[PDB]
């Protein structure tokens, strides 16, 4: 059994469009100085003529706000907000699948029990990002009890989501 | 055999002028918390009269954007964008060679297999920076196969590049 989301989701969170994915914890320990980071792998040719194959570019996940330093004790849903400075700013539902790209996700931290440091890498190909979905919750707050269902760790349902590019959605908003 | 670019290149990338150099990976392991940083070594006398010999100054390589935290699994081309806040802002092709300076490049990270931490330092003297060149690609995307040719790791070709100072190029752009 493993702990890292399989698919990624895109949908609305308080008006803004967001790219989301879950990240799993460790049963046998707490991770110190844990940090989540995510790169965007995708070839692109500079108008300048130079063709960079698999150029990488960083993806906002809370670097500026410090919200990329995780307190992982329970599965977390990392949420990228899709803004002007997002590489998906101009990508829409129908536009998604026909993108020749990939998202790498990297989790670093120093394990406590083991006194060693970990790095768990993973990826998502265009055909692994799900537009218009949200993650099934996996944390129920029972009577004086908080509990996770790792049986629903990957489970995702479908939600009403406009098929417009983040940029377009913000353009209509102005009107 | 080694893994760190010999010469550095300067040319255009989407309009902006950039100082570039390649950085090699490790065959026998992945590097965690890898970070690339680069200093600018060069003596300068303050108009104030004090002469600082080999004063050092940091060089933008993605600190602000977080793009200085590398995911190194394949040779990467670190690209410094030459802006107002670049120490090369006012340096042009013909101006380059006659500069009494040096660029130090430092790569830090914790190795996985070895469970030790590395620091690979290197430099470039004025006579080791190549104006108007780009790095030969070293990553071909064969039929269901990505591959590097470390035989072309240092190989560099010549490209059309204006012999103006970054500042000047931006001044003409305004007109």
């Amino acid at each position: 059994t493993l702990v890292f989301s399989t698919h990624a989701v895109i949908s609305m969170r308080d008006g803004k469009l967001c790219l989301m994915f879950r990240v799993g914890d460790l049963r046998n320990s707490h991770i110190v100085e844990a940090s989540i980071r995510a790169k965007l792998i995708k070839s692109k040719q500079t108008s300048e003529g130079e063709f960079i194959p698999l150029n990488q570019t960083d993806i906002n996940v809370g670097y500026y706000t410090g919200d990329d330093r995780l307190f992982l004790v329970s599965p977390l849903i990392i949420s990228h907000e899709i803004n002007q400075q997002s590489p998906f700013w101009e990508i829409s539902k129908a536009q998604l699948p026909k993108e020749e790209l990939e998202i790498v996700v990297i989790l670093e931290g120093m394990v406590e029990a083991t006194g060693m440091t970990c790095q768990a890498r993973s990826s998502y190909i265009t055909s692994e990002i799900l537009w218009g979905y949200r993650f099934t919750p996996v944390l129920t707050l029972e009577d004086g009890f908080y509990e996770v269902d790792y049986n629903s760790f990957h489970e995702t349902y479908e939600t009403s989501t406009p098929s417009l590019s983040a940029k377009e959605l913000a353009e209509l908003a102005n009107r | 055999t080694l893994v760190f670019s010999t010469h550095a290149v300067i040319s255009m990338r989407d309009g902006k002028l950039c100082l570039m150099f390649r950085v090699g990976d490790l065959r026998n392991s992945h590097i965690v918390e890898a970070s690339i940083r680069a200093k600018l070594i060069k003596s300068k006398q303050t108009s104030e009269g004090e002469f600082i010999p080999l004063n050092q100054t940091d060089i933008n390589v993605g600190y602000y954007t977080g793009d200085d935290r590398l995911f190194l699994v394949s040779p990467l081309i670190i690209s410094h964008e030459i802006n107002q806040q670049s120490p090369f802002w006012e340096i042009s092709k013909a101006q380059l060679p006659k500069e009494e300076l040096e660029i130090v490049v430092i790569l830090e990270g914790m190795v996985e297999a070895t469970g030790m931490t590395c620091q690979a330092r290197s430099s470039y003297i004025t006579s080791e920076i190549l104006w108007g060149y780009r790095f030969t690609p070293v990553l071909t995307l064969e039929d269901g196969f990505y591959e590097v040719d470390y035989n072309s790791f240092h190989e560099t070709y010549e490209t059309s590049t204006p012999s103006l100072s970054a500042k000047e190029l931006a001044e003409l752009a305004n007109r």
Binding site: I125 | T1, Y150
Partner: peptide, 17 residues
């Protein structure tokens, strides 16, 4: 399209030495 990185975490290979 072929991956650069695999779900498990391993990359895609080189030829040197």
């Amino acid at each position: 399209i072929q991956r650069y990185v695999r779900k498990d975490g391993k990359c895609n290979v080189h030829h040197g030495n």
